Point group: C3
Chain length 129, copies 3
């Protein structure tokens, strides 16, 4: 059965404006170099980092709505415990660590991401047999 | 198995333009006060009501494409029979009444919504064991 | 279980700019007449063809991420082998031919599409019992 579903839409300009601020949730996710690059909204880096961000958000939303979430407020370091990386063809891959990793060992996480010029989006489906 | 899938994209400005017109499908959904608020496209109310609207649409699309739909034209008062509300953390919740409620008693409806500044979106998955 | 998931976002203006170029992937999909129409970004044709395009892309992404894909690079004529058509109510329908048709005989493909004025989107879920 499906465990949780998440969708996220990212304004690429709003992302560029927020991405390169110290100690943001982005800083736990992306390197300082990546965030500097992505601060230019016209850049390839902004488009692809914003889609990576949408994917992570979508995954967190699916988690939030699921039975693995107890309190309504996200736990500590959910943002370090969930990573979404892309292969050299831009296909996303979910990587778990910490408590999330242990808790979600027996569930599958499906994720897809996309972007146009102004907007990025992703969908996540958490699923179990 | 999955019963039906739906996605919906809402222009927040186009929504603001349409939301506050008498006897629209919106009027069956949202209060006059909510619709007045949402008629300003720059408002928090427009952004969040448009995402609520996208969610409801996504759910109706999933229903339309499913075996629970006979005629291609939507039934009477589908719009009163399906409600999507948000908690104080903005997490959506589906509420059914009328015929839809009776018909869909044994199926789960997963829904997720999101918005940026100009656009809102939602996904719905209807699913059964 | 879910076999593969895909989401796609299409800039309707960028689509109009690309859709009517000879020997593009679009040319394998849509007729010359359809592509001429869709080259005007303000047109109904651009909006609906771009949503049809998003759907096909979403389906291909779901396929790419699935076990039915061996090499990371898409196979020959994936674009002729997968078709997404719309009924007169604008509900999408997947049509398979060639190798894809044979390979995916026992899996279901769920698809949904949508558009606003500037943007189109679709989601695809490939699923098996
Ligand atoms: Ni890109
Ligand atoms: Ni909001
Ligand atoms: Ni249309």
């Amino acid at each position: 059965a499906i465990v949780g579903v998440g969708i996220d839409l990212v304004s690429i300009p709003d992302f560029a404006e927020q991405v390169d601020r110290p100690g943001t949730v982005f800083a736990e996710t992306f390197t300082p170099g990546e965030r500097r690059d992505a601060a230019d909204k016209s850049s390839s880096a902004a488009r692809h980092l914003a889609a990576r961000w949408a994917a992570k958000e979508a995954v967190i939303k699916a988690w939030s709505s699921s039975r693995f979430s107890k309190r309504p407020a996200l736990p500590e370091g959910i943002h370090r415990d969930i990573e979404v990386v892309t292969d050299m063809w831009g296909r996303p891959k979910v990587r778990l660590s910490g408590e999330i990793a242990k808790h979600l060992e027996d569930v599958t996480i499906h994720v897809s991401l996309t972007h146009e010029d102004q907007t990025a989006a992703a969908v996540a489906i958490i699923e179990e047999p």
